[PDB]
Amino acid sequence: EIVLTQSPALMAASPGEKVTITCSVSSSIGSNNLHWYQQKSETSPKPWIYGTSNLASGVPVRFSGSGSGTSYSLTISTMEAEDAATYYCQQWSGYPLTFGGGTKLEIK
Amino acid sequence: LCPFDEVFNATRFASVYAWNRKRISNCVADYSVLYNFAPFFAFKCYGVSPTKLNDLCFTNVYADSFVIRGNEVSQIAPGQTGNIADYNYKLPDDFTGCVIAWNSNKLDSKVGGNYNYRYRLFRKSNLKPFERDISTEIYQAGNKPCNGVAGVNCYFPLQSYGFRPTYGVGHQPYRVVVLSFELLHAPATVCG
Amino acid sequence: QVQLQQSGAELVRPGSSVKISCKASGYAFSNYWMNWVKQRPGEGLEWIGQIYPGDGDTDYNGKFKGRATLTADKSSSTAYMQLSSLTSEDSAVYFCARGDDGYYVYFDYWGQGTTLTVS
């Protein structure tokens, strides 16, 4: 089973500040087969970045994923209070779909 | 006329983890046969004019034929790292050839599931360019020496693609045939 | 408008019978794959199975395989999940996610999630 690890379990951020969420994959996966979902507390997750760079519908322009191979990164240039959530990187290359442990983004 | 018929019109392509390399030489190669043959979801040539293929001479032409999901076709290119590119089939930095990919959903996907086509999900070292790896020993992912057993901490390396006709457009099976041109100090027997 | 609706939460004693329904509205139900995601409390989500409403094709995750049966009805556009031998670990919010048919494949739409209680 492909196993996903996300670098911060929680994160502390401030508006106007870059913060990066690193999703480290055991075995390299195609960037087209890694996606990021935003789960605000106790709500249904909605797709946020699909394909590691292509934002989904309604996604703010600040969000932009990066990376390829094993190490995948999500970065927000500025952290609005709306940006606080838990982000779950997913992989679909290896069939049993393994979401990341999640990075609970919180404001400083 | 070079056997572009056999390569492109194969009844069943090889799995990506063990891709069949067909070195074609001593024959006249016409690349107008490519265009008519298949819809060509992606046709990218690196380091070569697609036009000058017809009028250029090469001593050895390599055809690497395999089936990969559409999302992994972009992995087949110099400078690309991923699952296929790192583990199953890799191209050199200065790869000179044409990467040819067309969808095969009505052909290579079965309604219940197609578990014939596999890829190398786990490997210790990323492939050196153009290499082939068919060793299926259980990956020693766990600290415990795996001792040739498949289970927790010890994964069987080939995970089936499991194509189905109704999968997403990304995951429908694309048969990829990749061409490579040598031009070493040999009688150059492929031309126009 | 596209949105996936889901049945309310239920409490079930440890047993073999439970049925959770997903309601699909706004799109052709049979066209798009339907997959379920289980989110254990205070854990990252995991993927249960995949059901194609068009013909009823089923893909399951390894652990849930054979334990949870996924079926859908084209007529009412309902996607079901039935689990067996419910244990305290099975208590988790169950989402129904519609895998996208685009070049990238991802869970474009999700159900509100149903809370299963095993007690």
Numbering used by the authors:
A (entry chain L): 1 to 108
B (entry chain A): 335 to 526
C (entry chain H): 1 to 119
Recite the paper's sentences.
To elucidate the molecular mechanism of ORB10-mediated neutralization, we determined the structure of the SARS-CoV-2 BA.5 spike (S) trimer in complex with the ORB10 fragment antigen-binding region (Fab) using cryo-EM. Notably, the RBDs were in a “two up one down” conformation with two ORB10 bound to the “up” conformation but not to the “down” conformation. Local refinement of the ORB10 Fab and RBD interface provided improved density at ~3.6 Å resolution, resulting in the clear identification of the complementarity-determining regions (CDRs) of the Fab variable domains. In total, 15 residues in the RBD region at the Fab–RBD interface were determined to be involved in the interactions between the RBD of BA.5 and ACE2, suggesting that ORB10 neutralizes the virus by blocking the binding of ACE2 receptors to the RBD. Overall, the ORB10 Fab–RBD interaction buries surface areas of 489 Å2 and 544 Å2 on the RBD via three CDR loops of variable heavy and light chains, respectively, primarily through hydrophobic interactions and hydrogen bonding. In addition, 18 hydrogen bonds were identified at the ORB10 Fab–RBD interface. In the BA.5 strain, local refinement identified seven mutated residues (S375F, D405N, R408S, K417N, Q498R, N501Y, and Y505H) in the BA.5 strains that were involved in ORB10–RBD interactions, including three residues (N405, R498, and Y501) participating in hydrogen bonding. Additionally, two residues (W92 and S93) on the light chain of ORB10 collaboratively form hydrogen bonds with R403 in the RBD, which is mutated to K403 in the JN.1 variant. According to the binding epitopes in the RBD, ORB10 was confirmed to be a class I antibody that binds the “up” conformation in the RBD. However, the exact binding epitope of ORB10 to the RBD suggests that it binds below the center of the ACE2 binding site.
